[PDB]
Structures are given as C-alpha cells and as structure tokens.
C-alpha cells in the first residue's frame, strides 16, 4: 500500500514561499508558524494572511450582521447569560410574522431581520471582491469567484429575491441554528412538497454528484500519487503516466474518460449547478408554481398507490359537516 496517500511519513521544512501579487504584498500580516501534526495530512504552514480593504470590509459588515442577530437572540432569553448558552440553537432573528407585503416591517417584527440580511449581503459582496481580486492579483483565472457568485446568488434567492417576487418579506430565511432549519419545512409545506420540485431534484443530483466526483477524483489522484498525479498543473501542460493511467482506469471501467484538466471542469460545473439549479427552483416557486406535487400530478409524473387503511374522504366536504 502507498502509505503516502494516508499521511506524510517524512515531513520536509524549508524557507516559506511568497508569490508576489500585482498589488497588496504589503497587506500580508503575521509570521508563518508550523504544526507537526497538521503536516501529517496537509501543509504544516499556517499563515500569513492577506488583509486588504475587501476582507476588512467583509468582517466589518459581517460582524454587524452577527451582532444584530446575537443581540436579538439575547433578547429572546431576556438577556440571561445561562439561558442564552443553554437555548442557543433554539434562538433566532425572524422575518416578519405578520403580512406587510413588501413594506418595511417594524423592528420588533421583521425589521431587525431585514437589517441583518442587508449587512450579511454587503459582507458577502465584499468577500467576493476579495476572492475575485486576489485571483487577478496573482495572475489567475477567476473561476473560483464565478462559482462563489452562484452560491451568493442562491442565498439572495431564498433571502430576498423570492420574497420580492411573491411580494412578502415573511418568506425569508430566519437567522438561527434550528430556526433556519424550521424554515425548510415551512417552505416545503407551503409549496406542496419540495421533493416534487424538479429543480430540487436537479440540485440534489448535482450535490450527490459532487460527492461522487470528489470521492472518485480524490481517490483517483491518490491511486496515482506514486506517479506524481497530484502535480496536476504540469500533468495538464505535459501529460504523464499518472493521468494516462487515471484516464484508462475510467475508460476501461465506464467506457469513457476525461483529462486531468477537464475533470476539474466537470467538478466545477457540478458544484456550480447545485446552486444554479436551486436558484432556478426558488425563482419558480410561488412565482409560477404554487404546489409542486399537484404540478407533477398535472403533468402526469406523480406516482399513485392503493390505500392500505381505508381511503378517507375529507370530513369538511361531508354533508352537514361544520366549518
């Protein structure tokens, strides 16, 4: 067995490397320190880190959103420290409970939520600039930023775009551990079972697909680590036996294969589509589809089953039944 694929038997140490960017080199702060155990399964070096306006701004806007949420959560437990710690997961900052349409809700019923959302959004946008600019500074393509943009877009879809499309802030995702989880069921229920939303299915296929692909790709590279398969950049510009074998393993297994470069395009694409598919699903929900299950019944796709216990007529429709 190749023990190197499990962990690094013999670790190496040398002067830290610094690749100059078109700008921001003076914004790197800290002194690189090393961790022997981390070096078993990764690079032993930690830091330094790049600061910069984008990153700083991101933390400023983000910290504000977090403080708005934490303060409102603290209010839920009347500012009691012990109960705050205990009930943390159950605490949250909620969107308006009453129907005000698109009207700015009062602070006690949606107002603070809307404020936190605004600051989180600014935070995400600022961090995106960092993700984008750092790439350009180091002379790299902007593939990561475009993938990150799709993730941000999906958050905007469930956070404010869908709400704006149906005309109600009450539809937004609340901030909180359990509370943001509860929203999932409330939303699925309101829209006739999300299992019947095709885009929910697409998003899952791509998410499960990412699981399949990273397990497959990760395992493939480890399987050819003895041939330096991990040095993907030069395997791309100058094909080595590592990727010829990787390609043949798959070609002989499934009948077709990729290249060391294209497999990363498949992975990037599958990851992107998790967010793109989810966003399309959310944009269509409430806007053009009210009950996904019934939509599937209408188009003849929904499975039907015999009754086990007796079929049960809606009592409300029976003769003489009350309201």
């Amino acid at each position: 067995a190749d023990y190197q694929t499990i962990y690094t038997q013999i670790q190496a140490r040398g002067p830290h490397i610094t690749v100059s960017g078109e700008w921001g080199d003076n914004d790197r702060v800290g002194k690189p320190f090393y961790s022997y155990w981390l070096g078993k399964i990764g690079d032993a070096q930690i830091g330094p880190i790049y600061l910069g306006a984008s990153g700083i701004a991101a933390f400023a806007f983000g910290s504000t959103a977090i403080l708005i949420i934490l303060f409102n959560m603290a209010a839920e437990v009347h500012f009691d420290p012990l109960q705050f710690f205990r009930q943390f997961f159950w605490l949250g900052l909620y969107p308006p409970k009453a129907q005000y349409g698109m009207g700015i809700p009062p602070l006690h019923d949606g107002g603070w939520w809307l404020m936190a959302g605004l600051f989180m959004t600014l935070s995400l946008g600022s961090w995106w600039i960092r993700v984008y600019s750092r790439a350009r500074a180091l002379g790299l393509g902007t593939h990561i930023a475009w993938n990150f943009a799709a993730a941000i877009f999906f958050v905007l879809c469930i956070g404010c775009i869908h709400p704006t499309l149906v005309g109600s802030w009450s539809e937004g995702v609340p901030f909180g551990i359990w509370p943001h989880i509860d929203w999932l069921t409330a939303f699925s229920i309101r829209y006739g079972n999300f299992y019947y939303c095709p885009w929910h299915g697409f998003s899952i296929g791509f998410a499960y697909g990412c699981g399949l692909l990273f397990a497959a790709h990760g395992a493939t590279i480890l399987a050819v680590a003895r041939f330096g398969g991990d040095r993907e950049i030069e395997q791309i510009t100058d094909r080595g036996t590592a990727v010829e074998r990787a390609a043949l393993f798959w070609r002989w297994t499934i009948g077709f294969n990729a290249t060391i470069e294209s497999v990363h395009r498949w992975g990037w694409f599958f990851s992107l589509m998790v967010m793109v598919s989810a966003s399309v699903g959310i944009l269509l929900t409430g806007t053009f589809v009210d009950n996904w299950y019934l939509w599937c019944v209408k188009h003849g796709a929904a499975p039907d089953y015999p009754a086990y216990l007796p079929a049960t007529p809606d009592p409300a429709s029976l003769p003489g039944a009350p309201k």
Binding site: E76, V77, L91, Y94, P95, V166, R190, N193, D290, P322
Partner: protein
C-alpha cells in the same frame, strides 16, 4: 441518551412508503399501567323508586335517575375527580343541596359538557366516549391543561423550576419548544388554533399554479402560517404519542382519499370538538373559578389534545365506561 431495541412498528400506508407507528415497548407498557389506574365501573344498582327530581331539591341535570343510580354517579364522580378530597370538595357536609362551594357549580357544567361530548361529538369519541376521569385522572385540576400562554411542566402535578415559571421571561423559548415536541418553532399552536375557531390550519394551495388574486403581496397569508400549522402538528403528534404518518402520507399532506388515514378524519373532528369545549364550556368558567385558578390574563384553564389523550392515540388505550354510566351520554 438512546432507546434500546427492539422497536414496535406498525403499517399505516401502502407497502414501501415507510408509514406507520414506531413505539418503544417500555414506554407503551408504562403508559398502559398509568392508564390502567382507571377505576373499575361501580356495581350496577336496581332502578327502583321515584326520580331524584322528586326526591332531592337541587338536581338539574341528573333528575331522571333514581336515588341509588344517582348516588352511584356521585361516588364515581368522587372517584374520578376528587378521590383525595372526597364528597365535601364540592359539597357542604350539612346541606348537599347548597352551591356555596364553587366546585359544585363547575361540576354541574362539567356534567353538561361531558354529556355533550358523548352525545354531540360521537364523530370523535365514538362509542368509547369520555368520563370525568378521561381528563381529571383523579384530581380537581386536570394534569394537562393550557392557558393563553405556554406553561411548564406540561403536567401541572410536577413542581416547576424557576425558569419554567411563566413569570420568568428567560424561559419562554423552552416553554414553547416543549409544547411543540422540542422544535424551535416560534408559535403557540394552542392559542392560535385550539382556543377558538378564528384560524385555518390548512396552508397548502389546492392548485398546481398560483391563482391570480391570492398569490401576491398582502393577498397572501404570511409564511408564518405554515410554521404555525407545523407547530400544531408537532404538538398534536406528541400529544397522541405518534408521528405524522399516523394520519398523513407525507407525499401530500393536503390530500385526503388514499393520501390520509381514517385517523386523520377523526383528528379533524377532534379539532372541532376541542374548539367547542373551549369556547362554549371551559373559557366561560373563569367567572365561576377563584382567581388562583386563572391564568395571568384572567383565563380559565382550557383543553387541548393532550388533556384527554395524554400521549396515547386513544385516551386510556380505548378504555370505556359508556355503558356503565349511560347518564353521561349519549343522551337520547
């Protein structure tokens, strides 16, 4: 923090749909034993003599019973409601016709409510019916009641911690969570759906596409309605010691026919029954009860599903005393 196997499972839907109950034997056993405390029916008595409407002086509901039948009812009532306190809980030992003690008047109303349940709500209680014990379980104050705000412990016979106290604001979220099977749903389903008939439980559209005229802005019910209905369902599930599949095929919660079990229809009737009990029998009692019995809003304790069910799909696993005490209904 786990329950050791085996687990008891039943089937409530077509095979392959993962529908049915999931029960822990030790829990089922413990509940059956608690419920088995239901006092046996009292020996039958010969119906002889004139009706107490002629014999006694202040009988308004059970006037048709003979003296022996009537005294038998009183003994049962004492067994069911105030076995520890005795006859004097409602009576002046020197004048059994006096209404000086508040429990007397309330008890009379309760006799009418009980008879109404067994007579007007057979769609829910069927021929099993209910007796004072179903709710009271041997104490004047039923162990499971609700106020206009969540209260803890659910069983009022247990001493509450300071944080569980309704006056302690810091424990509100927990008082809410423990009423909704520990979820974090920020809604109290009792006041919203069971205290009265002001709200609609259904929140799912009955058409594939959004109907123009009810799908935009203020025309729409807030999404909070869906959280609330989910909260009521969590509460109902815990109150009957069961799960969603006992009544629904989750494929489509809003559909009936083959997508719902007979139990769901019975649950539907139960919601109507509870609202009737609360609005027309229990709530009005705040004018007949001492301040010490009322909630912070001056409300009288009211009923929810747990009040009778107490963690079982059928109160007391289906035990009945209907034929033993026909004076409690159905009244022909």
């Amino acid at each position: 923090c786990f329950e050791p196997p085996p687990a008891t499972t039943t089937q409530t839907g077509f095979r392959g749909l993962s529908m049915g109950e999931v029960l822990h034997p030790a829990t089922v056993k413990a509940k059956k034993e608690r419920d088995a405390q239901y006092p046996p029916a009292l020996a039958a008595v010969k119906a002889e003599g004139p009706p107490v409407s002629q014999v006694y002086k202040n009988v308004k509901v059970l006037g048709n019973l003979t003296e022996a039948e009537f005294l038998r009812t009183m003994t049962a009532i004492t067994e069911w409601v105030s076995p520890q306190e005795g006859c004097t809980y409602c009576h002046d030992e020197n004048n059994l016709a006096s209404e000086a003690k508040y429990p007397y008047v309330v008890a009379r109303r309760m006799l009418e409510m009980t008879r109404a349940i067994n007579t007007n709500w057979t769609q829910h209680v069927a021929q099993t019916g209910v007796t004072c014990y179903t709710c009271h379980r041997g104490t004047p104050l039923p162990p499971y009641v609700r106020y206009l705000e969540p209260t803890l412990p659910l069983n009022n016979r247990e001493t509450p911690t300071h944080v569980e106290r309704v006056e302690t604001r810091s424990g509100y979220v927990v008082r809410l969570a423990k009423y909704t099977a520990y979820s974090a749903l920020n809604y109290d389903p009792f006041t919203m759906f069971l205290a009265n008939d002001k709200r609609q439980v259904r929140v799912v559209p009955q058409t594939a596409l959004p109907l123009v005229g009810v799908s935009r802005g203020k025309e729409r019910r807030p999404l909070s309605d869906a959280y609330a209905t989910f909260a009521l369902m969590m509460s109902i599930s815990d109150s009957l010691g069961t799960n969603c599949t006992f009544c629904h095929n989750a494929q489509t919660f809003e559909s009936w026919g083959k997508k719902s079990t007979p139990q769901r229809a019975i649950a539907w009737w139960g919601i109507r029954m509870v609202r009737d009990l609360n609005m027309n029998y229990l709530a009005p009692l705040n004018a007949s009860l001492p301040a010490s019995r009322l909630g912070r809003q001056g409300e009288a304790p009211q009923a929810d599903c747990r009040t009778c069910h107490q963690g079982v799909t059928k109160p007391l696993f289906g035990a009945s005393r209907l034929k033993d005490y026909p004076e409690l209904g159905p009244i022909k």
